[PDB]
């Protein structure tokens, strides 16, 4: 294994993978090494089977495909709680473990990067380049000889069209494609990063890296290897890199570094959380912070690790009927249900229920002028200066999971759907900074969630809207009182839980179903197809109970960005318009860290694109032509370059 | 989008052909298909053939059908309000139907007495659409079209058993009873199923999904119920307005969205759907439109009228327990469902579930001796409709290798049912809206049995198919409960389950063989070498059958004729090219246009009207239809020549 | 008739097994009212056949309610004939 | 514990329990399971602390609305209509 290569890519997430594979493919002469903190992901059945993605977030002392960052300090804006932010700890990063929803950022998002080479128009070809789009649409804004497979999976779930009828009934329009770069207001069947033919998860490692390593010999893969720091020149030129074991499990925990040198380039693709930490402990970041830690300054870039941005997720859970198809029992570990789906996937993956994330519809939404007034001073102000003149930007995202996304240990029996919600461009802002030069120690962290009052109303408003959807669905059998806002029990807004009939089905032999004693829930009246339905009215106290419910239950969406921002240095930026870290030579960040502002999308698409854009930038610095298509992707069928149907088995 | 070229309202077979053909013909032609029901794409409760039966359940769960009930009790049905379901899902009937392959006869199309609709006019189009995947001794089938037609994965032993008994009773065997020339013979019955993939040949996947995968110009809107066609000053169809499928808006308000159409509006909402859209659009019966407060666009009293169908009867017979039937599957026996679901996934090319389990039948027609005992009023019909139309059968008959009946009203054990329908009924019904609102239930009347001619053929079929049941190897008896009310002492009275079959059902049962109650006359235990004679029938036996027809005759979902293609002064609604009278840029192309009936399960008929309808619009827009159509999803690459099964 | 009036008033009552009762004219207000859809669905909850109308084999009872005000069945001279016939057909030791 | 129970229960204590020392304020027991509707409980095992106020100050009534013996009577539990009852139950929690 080489002590010296041409390019080192630090962190094998989507961006790092795009970079590492595209360049090694661009030039068979160029020695490139991909260094990834977590384990190799290749042909791991707990990666490529999409329908098990949920477990990747278990904090259970076994799962190690994730690092969990906790707020160092408690937050008054989350009513005393310490926000928890995980991210990938595996080759492919997010792409190996994520929820696999295919979403794309609106056009302004990119234009609004205020950087040349990064306009929507600049990037559109690269958007198409990475896509193996395998589903219908009524536009030409998608790509069809790219590595990354996108489809509707093997099987959409009935509650998805249920959701769509309800959505229509409250005035969000149907659309063939909410990912056309154009849509802020509309409802679609949500696609997935899954190959409709193979039923496999379209992770970025098999697409860009494994592809190339199977046909060439200049792409090196070092897994289970935390990149401590970048090694610099007498003139801040990145000259190589040090890396350690993932596990600090040496004799008396003595630090064990291995230096591997870069003739030409060093890229950091270790994520919004990882990348800033490599800079700081390498001597690049806040000068006074580096000074307190004993790290020699190399470049004083205080914006390193600042401007932590995310999407803020709320999960509204609704009970549903027992003849509904949900994931809840599979999620509960019911052997013969798991046995059924595992078998179905191995036998015929082209149509298997496990060839899905079961998040099979949703919408990007935008409030009416009518609805603004119900929001507050602070958000209307944000609207005016950020959304008003930007009609392709959605305020909130809403989707249906065909199950309960939550701890089933804290959920009653029965089946649920959940309205998964995130705020698309929050005003609130966090940060992350090393506490030490040793790379095993936890850094200071502050997710930042809700430290701007403006972020409350749009979320509050999503709650109301996603509820009006739920109540209008055929599968609906009440709210889950336990996991909803703390309404006054005699507010017309207060929760209506499971009905007696759905209750009697769950436990037909139980001695307990329908015992009033405790008055713990107000039952729903049993389901009627013919029910005329009117909206929930909310009082001021109801809105406070919701605001308090947001503070308490608002969460990350793993759409982390902005910790090494691409803007001029003097505006607190960390990179050039070619992703060069200011004050350095031969060093680049390419991953979502470089984002100067947010994007209204699930950010796998975005990190792949930022990736492709880096491949270009680096390649045209090294006199290197990127090839299209990429090395054929393992297990995948030979694509055609143009739109086509599901093939023969 | 807000404006397209062609809007096709309703995505049944007919609507799928039109929308698909036209978008594939010219990729700059924008066409939107608005379908009141749910998208059916890649749904295993659609594409797997052997679960079709669930689709007719009124269990308050199943949402794939809309059920029409007679407004008023019919005297002719001894006081009962008839129920007539239709499909409420993309692909219409073709996404939930029984998947029985059957074609009308040559004289049926000729007898439209309409230019461009002769049999010789439509033979090319009948072939254009088929992907025939089974042997035959004729050249009347198409081999490069989108709709797959096969004998399924696996044929049931009872079909060949039926075929033998049918021989015993003088009905000859045929290679192909769907060769346009056959009114009287028996066959292995094909299916709208693809031999190789084991998948149901729905029209949406065949003609729409296919094109949506290779092109951008075909738009689909599901869960959208078309309220009304919008009209010009000069009665030019200009657009369409659709509503949510569920009336679930704030306080049940009416949220219409409008989509304009630069070139054409096609109503393909089916026999029950199209008249209502016309009616609330202002095309229909002037008086009705006046009362409901609708602006009259074209006074067409033919709209809603001359509803026609096939009249089903369902004769249920108890069979041996070693017989292979669908009953236990239909009951929801766990390891039986598990087995067949599994099997279908692993090898759909031979799976039991790659079948409708309706695996043999006949088209039949009475001899002169049979005519004599069918009374005057049929005999009249016969001389005026059948006598010199010799390719028209009177009755269809087929064996279901299981009980097509609520098993919650069925004793235990296995069954078969002789599924029967009257081919060309004289009886007529109608359908009319009772409000502008597209959610209020319409006035309706099946009209079944309101012409007395229709009794004799169905009586004849009951008796005849009983002779075929009695002579099978599987026959273990007749289910008294579900048969006519013969006198207990009449030779005609049912012989139910024998003591031996019974004992296998419940080997540890305590009541198997208790006479007490005399609820059945036991069959004798089966014998291979038993001589079997015709059941004799008296005048009172005969009355019992007419009673049973009146009590148990049903739709066959073969609904048509509510917008008859004939001259306006005859009660017409569309011209020879399916234009709606007194309007521009508006065509009915679905089964509504049929001015008379067809001796066939009407999926084949629906697709063919679709194809002819595509041709008509296509010549008007100066478009050339492409052959073959866009590749059908999941399907093997078809050669265009008769061929055998691939690895 | 007397025992039928007893049946109809029982908390357990969910209908009259039409197959094992007198041959009443379907329109007759005395005609049997068989199992209700809700009782059926419990029997074969995974079954594809429960609640299929086709055949018109039984007039389903309406679901059970403790409130139901109960009026006695009116029988015509016709109905009386059907019970007579049923008695001669099904009377025993 | 008295001191923290507020003025309105204290007055009742002075008048009803002060010198009636064989009278308990509260009852408490362990149900070796959840005495609640399990349809609204997570999975796992529970125990419940069953508590009741021994001598409430609060007062209800029941009154008929009709001669007919099948009609629901007027009713009011009267639960907690006397603030004295809150303190001891809070103390039990
Ligand atoms: C659970 C989850 C659900 C989400 N679901 C969706 C979805 O449904 N749809 C969607 O579009 N997006 C989703 N996302 C977001 C998307 O996956 C991420 O935004 C994306 O993966 C980030 O790409 P990245 O290259 O910027 O960094 P990352 O994907 O985070 O990759 C960083 C890599 O570097 C490694 N690393 C970190 N530090 C070091 C170090 N010091 N040395 C070496 N290696 C290091 C990590 O192991 C990781 O492989 C989700 C993410 C997660 C985790
Ligand atoms: C249960 C069943 C069993 C049958 N079995 C067989 C068989 O085995 N073999 C066979 O050949 N034929 C069978 N048939 C008959 C055959 O399927 C029909 O004749 C055929 O589908 C007719 O096609 P169509 O276009 O005329 O209308 P349909 O197929 O009935 O489709 C009409 C479409 O219009 C939609 N629609 C209606 N009103 C509106 C509105 N206002 N707005 C928007 N959309 C609307 C409906 O959702 C539906 O999708 C069966 C049908 C059913 C339903």
Coordinates of C-alpha atoms in Angstrom, one line a residue, chain B residues 4-181:
Chain B
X4 CA -52.9 20.5 -23.6
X5 CA -54.0 19.4 -27.1
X6 CA -56.1 16.3 -26.3
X7 CA -57.7 15.5 -22.9
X8 CA -58.8 11.9 -22.5
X9 CA -61.3 11.7 -19.6
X10 CA -61.2 8.2 -18.1
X11 CA -58.3 5.7 -18.2
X12 CA -60.2 2.4 -19.0
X13 CA -59.0 0.2 -21.9
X14 CA -60.6 2.5 -24.4
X15 CA -59.0 5.7 -22.8
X16 CA -55.6 4.1 -22.6
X17 CA -55.5 3.1 -26.3
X18 CA -56.5 6.6 -27.4
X19 CA -54.1 8.5 -25.0
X20 CA -51.2 6.1 -25.7
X21 CA -51.5 5.9 -29.5
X22 CA -51.8 9.6 -29.9
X23 CA -48.9 10.6 -27.7
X24 CA -46.6 8.0 -29.3
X25 CA -47.9 9.1 -32.8
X26 CA -46.6 12.7 -32.5
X27 CA -44.3 13.6 -29.5
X28 CA -45.2 17.3 -29.8
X29 CA -48.8 16.5 -29.2
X30 CA -49.5 17.1 -25.5
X31 CA -52.2 14.8 -24.1
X32 CA -53.5 14.5 -20.5
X33 CA -55.4 11.4 -19.2
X34 CA -57.6 12.3 -16.2
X35 CA -58.6 9.2 -14.3
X36 CA -61.0 9.4 -11.2
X37 CA -59.4 6.3 -9.6
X38 CA -55.9 5.5 -8.3
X39 CA -52.8 5.0 -10.5
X40 CA -52.3 1.2 -10.9
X41 CA -48.5 1.2 -11.9
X42 CA -46.5 -1.7 -10.4
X43 CA -49.2 -2.6 -7.8
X44 CA -49.1 -6.3 -6.9
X45 CA -52.9 -6.1 -6.0
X46 CA -53.2 -5.3 -9.7
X47 CA -50.5 -7.1 -11.7
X48 CA -50.8 -10.6 -10.0
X49 CA -53.8 -12.3 -11.9
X50 CA -55.0 -14.7 -9.2
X51 CA -56.1 -12.1 -6.6
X52 CA -58.7 -10.5 -9.1
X53 CA -61.7 -11.8 -7.0
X54 CA -61.0 -9.5 -4.1
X55 CA -62.0 -6.5 -6.3
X56 CA -65.8 -7.0 -6.1
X57 CA -65.9 -7.1 -2.2
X58 CA -68.1 -4.4 -0.6
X59 CA -66.2 -4.6 2.7
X60 CA -65.7 -0.8 3.0
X61 CA -62.0 -1.3 2.3
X62 CA -61.8 -2.1 -1.4
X63 CA -61.9 1.3 -3.2
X64 CA -61.1 -0.1 -6.7
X65 CA -64.8 -0.3 -7.7
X66 CA -67.8 2.1 -7.7
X67 CA -71.1 0.4 -7.0
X68 CA -74.4 1.5 -8.7
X69 CA -77.6 0.3 -7.1
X70 CA -81.0 0.6 -8.8
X71 CA -82.9 3.6 -7.5
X72 CA -86.1 1.4 -7.4
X73 CA -86.9 -2.3 -6.8
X74 CA -87.6 -4.1 -10.0
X75 CA -90.8 -6.3 -10.2
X76 CA -89.0 -8.4 -12.9
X77 CA -86.3 -9.3 -10.2
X78 CA -89.0 -10.1 -7.6
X79 CA -88.5 -6.8 -5.7
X80 CA -84.7 -6.6 -5.5
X81 CA -82.6 -3.5 -6.3
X82 CA -79.8 -4.7 -8.8
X83 CA -76.1 -3.8 -8.1
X84 CA -73.8 -2.9 -11.0
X85 CA -70.1 -2.2 -10.2
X86 CA -67.5 -0.8 -12.6
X87 CA -63.8 -0.1 -12.1
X88 CA -62.6 2.9 -10.3
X89 CA -58.8 2.7 -11.0
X90 CA -56.4 3.4 -13.8
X91 CA -56.8 0.8 -16.5
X92 CA -60.5 0.5 -15.7
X93 CA -61.9 -3.0 -15.8
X94 CA -58.5 -4.2 -17.2
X95 CA -56.9 -3.6 -13.8
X96 CA -59.4 -5.6 -11.8
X97 CA -61.3 -7.9 -14.3
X98 CA -61.5 -11.7 -14.5
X99 CA -59.0 -11.6 -17.4
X100 CA -61.1 -13.9 -19.6
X101 CA -60.0 -13.6 -23.3
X102 CA -63.0 -13.5 -25.6
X103 CA -63.8 -11.7 -28.9
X104 CA -67.2 -10.7 -30.5
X105 CA -68.3 -12.4 -33.7
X106 CA -67.9 -10.9 -37.2
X107 CA -71.7 -10.2 -37.6
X108 CA -71.6 -8.2 -34.3
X109 CA -69.5 -5.4 -35.8
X110 CA -71.2 -5.5 -39.2
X111 CA -74.5 -5.1 -37.3
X112 CA -73.5 -1.6 -36.0
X113 CA -74.7 -0.7 -39.6
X114 CA -72.0 2.1 -39.5
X115 CA -69.3 3.0 -42.0
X116 CA -65.7 2.1 -40.9
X117 CA -66.9 -0.4 -38.3
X118 CA -67.5 -3.5 -40.5
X119 CA -65.7 -6.6 -39.3
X120 CA -63.5 -6.4 -42.3
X121 CA -63.0 -2.8 -41.3
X122 CA -61.8 -3.7 -37.8
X123 CA -59.9 -7.0 -38.4
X124 CA -56.6 -5.1 -38.8
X125 CA -57.2 -3.2 -35.6
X126 CA -58.3 -6.4 -33.6
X127 CA -54.8 -7.8 -34.5
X128 CA -53.0 -4.5 -34.0
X129 CA -53.6 -4.7 -30.3
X130 CA -52.9 -8.4 -29.4
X131 CA -49.7 -10.1 -28.3
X132 CA -51.1 -13.7 -28.8
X133 CA -49.1 -16.3 -26.8
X134 CA -51.0 -19.6 -27.4
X135 CA -51.5 -22.0 -30.3
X136 CA -54.4 -21.9 -32.8
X137 CA -55.3 -23.3 -36.2
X138 CA -56.2 -19.9 -37.8
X139 CA -54.6 -16.5 -38.8
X140 CA -57.1 -14.1 -37.0
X141 CA -54.7 -13.1 -34.2
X142 CA -52.0 -10.3 -33.8
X143 CA -48.4 -11.0 -32.7
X144 CA -46.7 -7.6 -32.3
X145 CA -49.4 -5.6 -30.4
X146 CA -49.2 -4.5 -26.7
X147 CA -51.8 -6.7 -24.9
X148 CA -50.6 -10.2 -24.0
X149 CA -53.0 -13.2 -24.4
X150 CA -52.1 -16.7 -23.1
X151 CA -53.4 -19.9 -21.4
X152 CA -51.6 -18.6 -18.2
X153 CA -49.0 -20.3 -16.1
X154 CA -50.9 -23.5 -15.3
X155 CA -54.3 -24.9 -16.4
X156 CA -56.6 -26.6 -13.8
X157 CA -57.4 -30.3 -14.2
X158 CA -61.2 -29.4 -14.0
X159 CA -61.0 -27.5 -17.3
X160 CA -60.2 -30.7 -19.2
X161 CA -62.8 -32.5 -17.1
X162 CA -65.4 -29.9 -18.2
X163 CA -64.3 -30.3 -21.8
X164 CA -65.0 -34.1 -21.5
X165 CA -68.5 -33.6 -20.1
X166 CA -69.2 -31.0 -22.7
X167 CA -68.3 -33.6 -25.3
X168 CA -70.7 -36.0 -23.6
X169 CA -73.6 -33.5 -24.2
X170 CA -72.9 -32.8 -27.9
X171 CA -70.9 -29.6 -27.7
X172 CA -67.8 -29.9 -30.0
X173 CA -64.2 -29.0 -29.1
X174 CA -62.3 -26.1 -30.8
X175 CA -58.7 -24.8 -31.1
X176 CA -60.1 -21.3 -30.8
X177 CA -63.7 -20.3 -30.1
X178 CA -62.6 -16.6 -30.5
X179 CA -61.9 -16.9 -34.3
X180 CA -64.9 -14.5 -35.1
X181 CA -66.8 -17.4 -36.7

